[PDB]
């Protein structure tokens, strides 16, 4: 009672790739077989199912509509046909056979990683904000950190604030220019890995999630965002 | 240059209990010395002063009236005598010499809890 | 009577990180005659800054007070995990001295 | 983008999310689900690091072919455990529960003992 | 039904204290009493027990022989007399009646903290050594580090080789000077609040713990220690 | 150039012991004299220290009051005279002569082992509790393992909540009672070796540290604790 | 400056793999490019290199003559063809610059997991010997456990004798029953999962390794083997 | 079954294959080669789980554009060490020396800073 | 039950100690006790008995005529009276309580060790000799190595030669120096600590064990030996 599992790899987003699984050992073709994947440091998921035919054959909403399963019974194997690739999709895929109240998931095949990415060696520029909270009072000072895994060059870094259920504003760009229209109180400061953005004393108005942003390079990335409420 | 405090503990209310401060390393008859006192899961207060003679010694508003500071000079021991305790006596107590602009509360007794309570 | 207030009550941050805690007086602080201490649980208050700006001997340069008038600051520049404690300002400008309510570090 | 509707999948929540214990020790899991698990098809999946799930327990409290009996699940509705009575240095893994009784199968986030 | 304790507070090392305990509510007279203690951020444990007229007291193996427990009838008084009081002993201290198979300690008193110290500190200069165990093989080096939390003035530093079961042996003293036969293979160097000893080839007889000392003040105090295997 | 040292040996807690150091090979009467203990498995740690007639003598925060170092110059002979001896002052003792700039602790003694204690074991209950640590969610469930090392004869093992600050409050005794007031969601259960509590669902003030306590026999123990938060 | 890679996946013994690594942001035609892999839980370990025009390729004496490495220099591309694939060859492949005295590997590729099997996860009985090595004397009993990690079916165990240079030798099968010629000193036991081998007075001639095998299903397997010297 | 084996390769030794350190504590990291390593032709390594390796030091000395200066190579010959002078939280990670002064390149088995 | 030992520590040769251990818990009387001693590192060795009165007392011909057993049964107390101390009697000394056919010893003394020095801090010079046996043939050279834990002041090494049977005879003095008769086959050299007795061509009278003897302080050492076959 086994599954064989093959194929899988590193591939660009947007292409294709067709995974296999390999059954002996029981009555594959009444058996029901599913597709569940693991991101990488996450949990389990399922993707995709198909039985007997006269049955539905179902998909999660991640899936349906650039992925398909299939098997040909004649040769008891599974397929996942693997399409439109995108970053989100990169995940250790197991076949898995389906008992239902008999079982679960009893049998497992062992795995194939796909991991689906154009990037090189290859580090896009980390920013960690700190604190994560910042709770506060009308009046008095808040101080944001933004620390970068590399050097930003031409200390090219933005702040923004942004409200709930509107767009982000821009605050201050070049780490230390304040756009025009924002308030002499918001001030960035710093240079290379270390930035910190400065509201000298808060008004009611300045509760808001704020995100750092460097765009010295071709990826832009942001920070995860300081709550000051 | 330290300050070994002793004395304090669990007391009824209205009771009394005197506490000790010895000092060694530092010029003890020319300092002022100075209690404060941190109720549990609370901040830092002063309680009172001492200084050299001819110069007044203080209270807060909270002891005033119960409590008396005093010092042995050559013994090199400070004192706080506490009467007519109360549950919101109840904190840990600390003897500190005041450097004022040469330090603050430079040095720090490790502190002893006064519980009042029945 | 001089009133202190810090902010944050609380910052929870990681090794490596900074943390600026401030310190608001409700009158001008004669001398700049404000103190920092820091107290780790079960033991007494340990200082920091006097002065507001003079740091005490054998205490680290990662720990720094700066400010004047009425607006003071402490910056801790790369927090270890002995920094993590509540941290106390304090004015000894006149004759009732008085603390902040302390912000503690976690 | 979405298929489904206002409904809402059955969603798992184990806890506590890490167990820090020693060999011989017992290990007790929570799974708890936001609507109740039809038949009780729920099931206990262990996981060690770089190996595909092995299932121990299904339909609750069914013990699969060749898990020792100190594995052993309870509970019905919305309140699952597992028990791992006595621990061996083989049962350090993450653990997962996993609810069969509709269309849209889910899983818990996962208990890790260490 | 209540136990109304008093006493406790700071004391010096071999001083003594006692503590008391009065009870109300219950026939005390016949009641077994216990004394329970928890150190500060450590657990409940067991000191003393004393029961009925033909007195079988019982204490902890620790407090054999410098504290005696005793009760006064007449007054509904438990006594727990502590002499030899040591750093050890600082806990909080608590009277409980044992009700056995009717309810263990079903009634405590409030607590009343005992600390035994000399002191408050402990502003002695703190050595760390680096790292706590180094596994090598013969002719490799070993590199040891030591920081100290104040400069040291004058390197007043030491390092000392110890085996099991023998003495301390001094190898370098004022950082980098080689006491008399020691081989060259042994080597410190360092200044202000970094030091370190290197090892340049190991032998089979080098293999052993390594402790830094600093005696630039009188507060002597050594690391904990590298264990080289 | 050499430190004959003798006394030592096995003492009961609250004891008292001396230490004797006879030098020979240098100029003992001119010489600075430690002495330097060690726990067993720990590190190095200074004791006291004595010089020439004119200078002060220094005790460790942890034996003043308690230890007196003295010398007699006319036999070439260094002493410590311990009193109120505890288990903490367990270790090997050493004499050592200090030559400050000119080789630190250069010479010393071959060390004699005091050992303070009243017994032997040991052969308590040992229980342990698990986990050590349980974060979860007001309305969750925690289960509370406690283990004994023998059989708790008559299931005498109680349940303490403790919060921060406050006296331990009896939960469960004879492993399944409910004491009174106790809540219904608490619940003890479990025999011989192996107890549980549990707290079917979880309110915010039932977030406190809980200890077992066995009580079958003359030297009651506690378990260690689980934290639940 | 970057290298992207593509390819890899899960595939049977015996299968067939290329590997590709796509070049950008410099001379890709004058670099020396390299293919090195990590096998999971495993150090670096170089595989093949290619440089210019003279194609001078160099392999590991692993792959020489199952891999071959290649680069088409019109499309920036450097390839690898793994042929004859072993469990062995399980890892993570990294095509990499090789810059030399300028750099090293100084440009690397993300990496591609290859993992080469036929679906093995274990159902098979694992067998553990202890102890792994025996000193004894003649004269002496020699006792030899095997343990099964699940039942053994009908008692299929048997123990083999292997001298060094020499094929093994039967001496115990169906767990307890004696094979023809062996002296009455040997004897086994056991039921289950626990099984013994038991010398009752070593001979000189008894020195040797022995193992244990269980024969109880479709996947043999035996145990690592106890040496008696 | 072998094609030649073996051998010349030079054969790097690294020490110790664990430390444990804390932030701020000095990391001291030993290559020692079988031969000579000839132009002192060798480089360091950092890994990080499930990561490329990342350049340090080449040359033995030669700090790579972008590494911080508290990362120091040293050495020659035979006996080669990586120093990092005060080490932070994103410093614990595995670290490979890496000769290539011959046709056959090889690495050491790492040091592990934990 | 049990027993609590005192006494010990370091002394004097030939100096005086007496051990004590104080009974609880059982009819002491009746009991038979005895005492178990345990050198560094080496195995249980029983010391002396002592039963009823009506009984005589046994001692190891280590201790007898050196060292008195007695009991005082009014104070539950067992006594070892040690005279006339050697270094041969350093060890950690046990009490015990024999059970015969109902316990053998079932309780033990925790112990105390007792160390019979006169030495300082710094150990003796250690000899080295490798290897322990040399197997040759007439004709054949033989090559002999001394290595000292510390360099022999003035190369004061000796060489000796012992047949069963018969007394050391000198070979070699000053490390090189050949004694008078000695034929100049016998060759020594080396020197600090690094020595080596050679000899050229092995005839069948030089099969002996050969010492090495160093004699440049107060306390002379020898190595182990080494035995030419």
């Avoid at chain 1, 039985?51 to 399963?69: E, P």
């Avoid at chain 1, 756009?179 to 109180?185: F, I, Q, Y």
């Avoid at chain 2, 941190?38 to 110069?55: D, R, T």
Wanted: proline letters at 4%.
């Amino acid at each position: 009672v086994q599954l064989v599992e093959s194929g899988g790899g590193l591939v660009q987003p947007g292409g294709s790739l067709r995974l296999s699984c390999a059954a002996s050992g029981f009555t594959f073709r009444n058996s029901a077989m599913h597709w569940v994947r693991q991101a990488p440091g996450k949990g389990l998921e399922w993707v995709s199912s198909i039985w007997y035919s006269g049955s539905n054959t179902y998909y999660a909403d991640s899936v349906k509509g650039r992925f398909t399963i299939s098997r040909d019974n004649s040769k008891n194997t599974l397929y996942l046909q693997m399409n439109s690739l995108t970053a989100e999709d990169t995940a250790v895929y197991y076949c898995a056979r389906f008992a239902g109240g008999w079982g679960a998931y009893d049998v497992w095949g062992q795995g194939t990683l796909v991991t689906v990415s154009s990037g090189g060696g290859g580090s896009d520029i980390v920013l960690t904000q700190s604190p994560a909270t910042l709770s506060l009072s009308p009046g008095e000072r808040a101080t944001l950190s933004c620390r970068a895994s590399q050097s930003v060059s031409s200390n090219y870094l933005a702040w923004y604030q942004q409200k709930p259920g509107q767009a982000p504003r821009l605050l201050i760009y070049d780490s230390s220019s304040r756009a025009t229209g924002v308030p002499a109180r918001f001030s960035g400061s710093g240079s290379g890995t270390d930035f910190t953005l400065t509201i000298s004393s808060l008004e009611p108005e300045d509760f808001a999630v704020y995100y750092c942003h460097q765009y010295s390079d071709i990826s832009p990335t942001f920070g995860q965002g300081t709550k000051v409420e | 240059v330290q300050l070994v405090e002793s004395g304090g503990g669990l007391v009824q209310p209205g009771g009394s209990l005197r506490l000790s401060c010895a000092a060694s390393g530092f010029t003890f008859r020319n300092s002022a010395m100075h209690w404060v006192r941190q109720a549990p899961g609370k901040g830092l207060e002063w309680v009172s002063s001492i200084w050299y003679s001819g110069s007044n010694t203080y209270y807060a508003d909270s002891v005033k009236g119960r409590f008396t500071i005093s010092r042995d000079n050559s013994k090199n021991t400070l004192y706080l005598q506490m009467n007519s305790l109360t549950a919101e006596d109840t904190a840990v107590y600390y003897c500190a010499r005041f450097a004022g602009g040469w330090g603050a509360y430079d040095v720090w007794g490790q502190g002893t809890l006064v519980t009042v309570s029945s | 009577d001089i009133v202190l207030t810090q902010s944050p009550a609380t910052l929870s941050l990681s090794p490596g990180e900074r943390a600026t805690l401030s310190c608001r007086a409700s009158q001008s602080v004669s001398s700049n005659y404000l103190a920092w201490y820091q107290q780790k649980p079960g033991q007494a208050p340990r200082l920091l800054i006097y002065d507001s700006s003079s740091r005490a001997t054998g205490v680290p340069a990662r720990f720094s007070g700066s400010g004047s008038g009425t607006d003071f600051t402490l910056t801790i520049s790369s927090l270890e995990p002995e920094d993590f404690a509540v941290y106390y300002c304090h004015q000894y400008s006149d004759i009732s001295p008085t603390f902040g309510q302390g912000t503690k570090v976690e």
